[PDB]
Subunit: 334 residues, 3 copies
């Protein structure tokens, strides 16, 4: 007999986030979301390597869901008959039934509706978890995303001062395990089922072949670079459902960082690199001070440069010579 | 000339913890413990894989020792003549002589008695460390446990409020390195000595074959599941003497977490996943809100599901539909 | 038109640090440093294994630079014509142009001068980053160091009390990737260029062959052990530019630790083991209470004992029997 107002949310593909309020005068609502599972073969790198992906809403990561503390989140999970496997969903933000996993197992052709109360603030992972050895396999195949539960008064610095972001991006990092053949080339498979045996063997050795943001090498570069202007406060939500990450904004800092991702704790200030524990999401805010290109990386630099984990920001505005200047350009040594 | 009262403790096998007070009106005491080293071949998985273990008190991990700040901990370490190797003990809680290691080296047939003052609060690792390449080998063979040094006033939230647990469990995570033969089956050995060469070769490649709680795959499941009731505040002490872990209670949270394990620091609140640095112990408290099965895992899900690192909690009590409800059971898609 | 006083610093090889003030009554200055790149073949272990190193100032790590908040750091980077490759420098302490990387790319025979304002306090990594796959390779070849930006009032405990160190050491940890030949021996190369192909192949598998402090196995042991006396407060700055580390002082503690390395945040107290995220520097202070040998290690004990990551401290002073005592020396079991 829960008779609160209902509000539908139109989810958007990462790294964008659906429109929301930070601080709100709204009371609790039932916020309604729909996720549709899609299994699909995708290209994950510039050499054309393929991968048997399984996704929420067709994307890796799944879309960011945003609600406020005390809202009730009502999710319709749909597993169309064009898929081959059972799936479910586990929200780390939710309390009971294995985060909802025990109440959302659906075969192809079925859908289910789960409601949970958002009692804990922060950014949290959600992922598929359909039992036993299937749990890691579905997660590293792409079935993970995040939810952000905001305080009703918005974010604060722990010292009584509001922290308002001008925009938010969601960067989902995915460790992928693509086996190679005898000659050393990556293998392609006709189905997730067929990829399973070789993939599981590789997974158990714990070293990924690729580590990517937003599903592919170079996904957040070029035309699809993240953007900002000098003076803008940007929130970057970062998730990793299986393996640790160490985010770093090259040329900037984390001005305010919740590395464990939970807004009941004050943020740390002035970080160079932060740490996202496997199975969690964290958040970092930075006010841009300089224009130009920034790279956002995990600062295992082999992963960043060689396995796929680099995004770009293109920042517009005026160069600040007080902060940094080339005193003398490259010249022959005297 | 230390003339304080003496108190004997009867240690109990993990994941249980010997009876103790949280807040106490006792002053400092000499608390007396005995550890007896046992080298033994054990079965570590459901397929019957064997492992040359070396243990304190016959268990992996070694038992949790519990004392209060300012107590003196007096340990009798015994290395029976049925063992083959020298051993010692290093307490991370202790100050000087390599944590006691430099004062406790004993050959088979010998015992030693060490006393140290508990000047630092928290949960701390203890482990064998008998010099050079032997140090990692003895530790990953099972020779590690933990000690908890409580404040005399018990635990607090950093905001002046007492945090009292209704029960405590100790989960010791062990990375194990079992070599395989040419055909790909795990190897068995007649002695720790014989296992050394092949084991060291594998250890240096840094990828474990198994990652287990309480010594074996499935140790804390079934009849030996951890238990609680809705409304109970449970403290989970987690240690890892060699390699990082990322504990996560599936379907719950860390309400209060000391991830670095030290009670001089306020706990963080409302975590989804926490991080236990290799060579440390941490502690997390959670008040159960829902009945049913929970899994406690490291949230590298490949390790949890495929290499052995999953425990269960079975929780009794009344389901709370406000927190979570199946709005519509699995049904055919319209 | 920046007309502040100028101050030259004579850099010193790690683990020592150039003379500096903690708290200062000086106002902002332009502090001038020079770094000269050297590519060179070095011996990294006791068996005589060689490695194609690339360094700032001839050392791994590069020297620690120390300044105060609000100073301007003016660095002359020199790439002599005896080197074979372009190089640059990226300061994590600096704001804009990829930390200076985009303004400091120099071919052999060139030098450049960069100035940046030290707006953020803490210890920060600096490293070479000359684009694409070259970035990880130059960093794991040795091209990394750290800078420490002190508050003008010196360090504090977060509770209003000054924390003054009697000495500081800089420990730079380096993950190295040396390939092996068919028979299993480490390979030697005539040039960095020639080492590249085999080295990159190994790097992408993410497991180092060696993990060393100050450039070599056993660098900070023997004649070159770190030293202290009972009663001395020592600051240990630890950096790792590519891979996580878990520092631990065997027989001691971290009394005050900034594991994320940033002095805008209060230190944690009473740690056993702390965590240095890959791409960062952290700092820990400890007041020695006992004489004798301590080991400082990463507490992945396989790395510490088998791959090279152990330093020693030799501490002079009076043994404290209250803190720790051998009650009964090794004796036959009754
Ligand atoms: O946002 C969590 C807490 O942050 C801070 C405020 O003092 C408190 O009122 C608030 O509840
Ligand atoms: O427990 C450590 C500290 O926690 C808090 C209390 O304010 C303080 O009195 C206590 O010593
Ligand atoms: O050092 C950073 C801060 O530490 C503390 C002091 O209360 C504050 O004045 C100082 O700015
Ligand atoms: O930012 C969150 C933090 O801010 C405060 O409300 C005020 O200090 C704390 O109680 C909380 O942990
Ligand atoms: O919970 C431990 C914390 O609680 C306090 O005593 C009170 O804020 C702090 O000084 C300490 O760090
Ligand atoms: O030590 C640094 C910390 O000390 C304080 O200035 C006083 O509590 C804090 O504002 C800061 O985070
Ligand atoms: Cu699934
Ligand atoms: Cu999970
Ligand atoms: Cu031993
Ligand atoms: Cu140890
Ligand atoms: Cu370089
Ligand atoms: Cu960097």
């Amino acid at each position: 007999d829960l008779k609160l107002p209902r509000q539908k949310v139109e989810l958007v593909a990462p790294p964008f986030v659906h429109a929301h309020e930070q601080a709100t005068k709204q009371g609790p609502k039932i916020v309604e979301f729909k996720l549709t599972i899609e299994e699909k073969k995708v290209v994950i790198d510039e050499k054309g390597t393929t991968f048997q992906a399984m996704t929420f809403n067709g994307s890796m990561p799944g879309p960011l869901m945003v609600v406020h503390e005390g809202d009730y989140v009502e999710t319709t999970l749909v597993n169309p008959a064009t898929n081959t496997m059972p799936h479910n969903i586990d929200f780390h933000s939710a309390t009971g039934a294995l985060g909802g996993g025990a109440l959302t197992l659906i075969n192809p052709g079925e859908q289910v509706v789960l409601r949970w109360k958002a009692t804990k603030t922060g950014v949290f992972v959600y992922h598929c978890a359909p039992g036993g050895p299937m749990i890691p396999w579905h997660v590293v195949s792409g079935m993970n995303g995040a939810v952000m539960v905001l305080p009703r008064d918005g974010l604060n610095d722990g010292k009584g001062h509001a922290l308002k972001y001008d925009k938010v991006y969601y960067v989902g990092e995915q460790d992928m395990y693509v086996p190679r053949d005898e000659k050393g080339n990556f293998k392609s498979y006709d189905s997730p089922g067929e990829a399973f045996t070789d993939t599981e063997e590789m997974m158990k050795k714990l070293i990924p072949s690729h580590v990517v943001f937003n599903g592919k090498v170079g996904a957040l570069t070029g035309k699809n670079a993240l953007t900002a202007n000098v003076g803008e406060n940007v929130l970057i939500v970062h998730s990793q459902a299986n393996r640790d990450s160490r985010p770093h904004l090259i040329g900037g800092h984390g001005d305010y960082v919740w590395e464990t991702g939970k807004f009941g704790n004050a943020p740390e200030v002035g970080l160079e690199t932060w740490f996202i524990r496997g199975g969690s999401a964290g958040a970092a805010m930075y006010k841009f001070m300089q224009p130009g290109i920034y790279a956002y990386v995990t600062h295992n630099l082999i992963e960043a440069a060689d396995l796929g984990a680099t995004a770009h920001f293109k920042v517009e505005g005026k160069w600040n010579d007080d902060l940094m200047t080339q005193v003398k350009a490259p010249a022959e040594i005297p």
